[PDB]
Write a protein that binds this ligand. Sequence first.
Ligand SMILES: Fc1ccc(-c2cnc3nnc(Cc4ccc5ncccc5c4)n3n2)cc1
Length: 282
Amino acid sequence: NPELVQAVQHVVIGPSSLIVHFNEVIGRGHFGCVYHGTLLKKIHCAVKSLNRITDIGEVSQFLTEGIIMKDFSHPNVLSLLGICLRSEGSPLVVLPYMKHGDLRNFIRNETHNPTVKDLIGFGLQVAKGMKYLASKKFVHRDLAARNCMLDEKFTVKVADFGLARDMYDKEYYSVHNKTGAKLPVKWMALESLQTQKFTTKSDVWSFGVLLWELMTRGAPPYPDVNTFDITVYLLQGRRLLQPEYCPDPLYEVMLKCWHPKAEMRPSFSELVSRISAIFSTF
Ligand SMILES: Fc1ccc(-c2cnc3nnc(Cc4ccc5ncccc5c4)n3n2)cc1
């Protein structure tokens, strides 16, 4: 498609400008692995392979869906460095290197031992990136602690969307839902599990879950709820319990994020205010 081609060409990177270390895997997704690469004056970057997508139609659909990523610019949103097209193989997606990897592995690491304040700060950052994406009317559909990255300045990048989209930890995606496709059902809003529709308000639901992951330092949500039972569990009005070290007012925020009525849930702009106030009392 010539239109998709014009868009891609805005961000194309010539094969000569990119060195990829295929012996240095730093990420594993369903569409391909992530590698240490260098972009040219050498910039250290992360190179996401799409090679597992071999069908040209599907490659076209993925590029079509994710290309808008080049139009986003915000300190808490992961940016696109470019796309490297070559003579043999699927396009390589080139992204900025994130020195501290994904937020979930970061807060789970026991030498790190992040404080309550550090954790609420991380959540404030995500709230702000999500606030920007919502203002662009972009719906994420897979927000979770595993899907936010941390750069060398400990700035949190909302990630795993657009051209970087993939399943980077397979254990938390299940076919036990109405679509039959692999979905993150334990981060999904109740109405999304029922109607298969995703909105910014269902993103807010996910953000609530991510907040919970933060305060538990990366505990898996509903460890005792089988993927078969997640929908009925939420229908009965049950929710994630308050983490031991979560401040009461922040747990109140989580609960609002999981209000059964989508319209009744806060906006990300409101969440930035409330969490910013909570963070400041630390
Ligand atoms: F163990 C895990 C858990 C999660 C991820 C994950 C989540 N969302 C993402 N969005 N884009 C990327 C690629 C991407 C971009 C820059 C990176 N920088 C350093 C290391 C890996 C990277 C991967 N990711 N990656 C990777 C490894």
